[PDB]
């Protein structure tokens, strides 16, 4: 009793259906079908133990993902989808091109990334800033990440290997975990930028 | 003293080689960074331009709708007056046909004239001059159509003022 | 006496034939009149429709002008930031090439290094750690382009409201 | 507007079909599929409105916002097809080649300068251009030129040195004006595939 | 090319009779008037077509008393609808002289004055 | 004559200035062309590299799938033999518990010893030799697991042969 | 006599007590044996999974090597064509700079006029129409990079059919 | 660290009796044997744990005739499971001497010989 994708679909198709009769005239049998399918989907959500909101969000990525064209599509508006291929920058060019020195170097090889940190830093609030390319709602390839103190000094760096580009997003999440652990082991408070939180946790 | 200082500066220059390697790699990462930043602002500019063009095409479609609605109001007023005139044409042609028929009836009644019954046959037809029918006046609503024209000119002038208000917000190169 | 009454009513019927002729001519003139009146209202309607169309095409040309001006403001802001980034790319690549050259020169200086003049040739280079170059920040004018987008959306909404005020002046069938 | 709903329902039924027509879906779901199919056929009969045409109308009416999408999101959607390239019909030699007009005609079409030799007549001319393309749209033109059957240059659309850049419709207008000015001299004008893709 | 209508459809289709008929052929036009109408103020109303700023083809002209009664008429011959503005002007002068000879005072509508 | 030749060559040089202006503009357009060509080959290279990276990540995911499947077959064979051993443990522990219970019962029956009824109480407790159930030998399928190991080694060598065949088509820098 | 049979049956039951605990001791040793057998097959299975995982990581490292080598082939082909284009940019810019300099000379020679030496200074300038420069075509080896992509896709497909061949060697429940 | 099993699960989980019991404590091990067995070829099989290349802890050792019958046994004391390989070797020598003194011929499995 598992193939309940049809419920998610029906939750999606109903909500958009509402829109029509919920703003324009639509039709009276159409609105009657709206109310009837509403009650039926409520009963199915009760007997399923599955939320309508969550199943509609699932209907989003279960429908909008396999709409290929028999014939010529919804001209997936670029005002609403450019797609979302962008490049995010927490760091300034000065911050990027700046050179730094570790008193107690720690170098580790996390997959295709090199993590570097100054172990001498202790009891500081550190913030992570990174410049990286984003595709859709996922990180694609990292250009650089660095760790700044409350005062702006560099204390850590996640950089891809010069000979071995590129990498995935999960490799970057692993490197982030390793760097945060190595730094917080020295009594350091680690905060992260909003973009990094968005594509790292 | 010079051979050991030679080894000393060999070792110091060797560690300087590694710091150079790391800084050159940092420079390559900064070059990728600047390239990706310019690529991002290119994408942003193109996206904003296509959103602008989509908005201006929506405005053009609204203008098309307004144009069609105004021309439909004008054609419906035209067709009103012209169908009143068509019914008047129909009435006048009916009366004209009655008179034409009676005229030909008198003309071919004058061929059998030297029989006594000609009087009995034709004294009725001098009496029947059924020529009535009242026609009310039809007036095209000039004020309405000239007001539509005046008001569309006013809307054009108001769009002029609107676009001026829009463009004065930002600098022009 | 009946032949004289026959001539009498022949004469009366012929004179009524003549009045019928004059009435049929009047009816034909009235038909021409109604045809010409409807033709005139047709001409008036067509003239007003062509004036409407020229006003709406003028408005469309003003929209085209505003569109091209806004898109030119955005493309020149794009080209500003992209030429700043291109020059920054050029500066960083020039510095990187100088440092790369000096690094390889140090690497190919170590093959004849246990020759005495190595110290004289390399004691200058321990002093030369030229790693400078300051990069000022380049910022795309986000407020300007977001304001252009927001204000063109505002232009569309107020054009909608204007057209609404225009069309509500008259009835729709 | 009592017939918007039929179009809507035809679109939603098509997309509904897709699901059980490829994936497993559900058995009651497939019965509703067949039942709503027959019911929509009956409604298309009683409406006097064809199901195919009304389904295409349901497509183009349930596709121009608010479809994709608002509000929501959050993950689970995107809907697009990126691209960023630079197309070249002309060789570097053709670009860097210099040419001369016997009867010059110069026009300023928006941000573009159109130039043509009016002395050219009764030739099959082909238009080749080098230009940057973004997504499925033209972005910025670098140059366009007109070659004869023999390869001689007879026309040129080039942006103004002081005023870059421009849009795609400016380029389409310049193309129209150039083609008109050349075909007025009894010339047959053909266009390269890339230009046809981003001008007509 | 426009059409000017001094007279209403009722005035154009109304019938009238002359107590003392007077008819005259003025080139391609026919002029009729009632020689019994005297000492009245009469106004000439006409329905006619106009091209540019000149008269093109007359459809009908009628004379109205102060009380609105028809006392005269200018109409094209059925076999000769074609005519010029000058023929109409001469016909108007003849009709004006004929009606004024009976001590009438004649005025012409502004459209008739212009053309 | 020299002032007129001065005006002559002034006019000819002015027309030469205009042709040079058009040629320098053509040169700037050719520079834009080469810059854009470099940009295009950069984009092409990056796109092909990302396609390569996606293919190699897909291959790594196939290796992960094969690894998990092989380890699941090995753990299921382990669990087979270990559940047979668990059932054998259960049988032996039940027999041991039966004898343990009987052992305590007979030890506490020999404490009531100087009653005649002790025989009646204890002659039942003698030969209760609960010695049942035969246990067959359990054998882990060693051939299967060592063959899985051998075959994954063979697949590694076959991947070596594939990668070699791939790389030998092109020269290496 | 019954006290003697009581002592007799107590002694026989005591000897049966000793044989019973000796068998329970054997049973506890058999339970320990089964426990150790289970632990041993656990150890063998786990070591084989560790050997499988080390082989699969070796295969993943071979994939990494192939990836890096293919991407290096693509980057050096990119840089070859991009350095050819850089040299072409340099020649075109040099020609543009030469013509720009001569243009400035003509522009600032025609501002100081009505001198006899003006003819002498500009009669050199009427002759110099040096407008040549030949640019050879640069062509990226598209066949090579598209074939590298096609062949890496083929390698993925061949690995799929491999591993497919591997898992079919063993049964599925 | 592995576990070696000369004996099947069936062979160890079987009961046996000695007609003439002989028991001896060899340090931390208990040696039992039937002194009534004579003139037989005997093989010693044992299940025991192994670490590196040495014996760590013995679980059980039993003597089997050519016909598969148990005639002797080596088992750790319940209070003393700990022991070394050498005490086990000494116990094996004692059991071999005890069975051989009554004209038996004893052989040892290869695994027992190794350890």
Numbering used by the authors:
A (entry chain E): 3 to 203
B (entry chain V), C (entry chain A), F (entry chain N), G (entry chain I): 190 to 362
D (entry chain D): 4 to 203
E (entry chain F), H (entry chain C): 87 to 201
Please quote the authors directly:
Tripartite motif (TRIM) family proteins are RING-type E3 ligases that play key regulatory roles in innate immune signalling pathways that lead to the induction of a type I interferon (IFN) response and production of inflammatory cytokines through activation of the IRF3 and NF-κB transcription factors. Activation of RIG-I initiates a signalling cascade that depends on the E3 ligase activity of TRIM25 and induces the production of IFNs and inflammatory cytokines. An example is non-structural protein 1 (NS1) of influenza A viruses (IAV), a multifunctional virulence factor that binds many host proteins during infection, including TRIM2527–29. To understand NS1-mediated inhibition of TRIM25 activity on a molecular level we have determined crystal structures of the CC domain of TRIM25 in complex with NS1-FL and the isolated ED, and of a TRIM25 CC-PRYSPRY fragment, which includes the RIG-I-recognition domain of TRIM25.
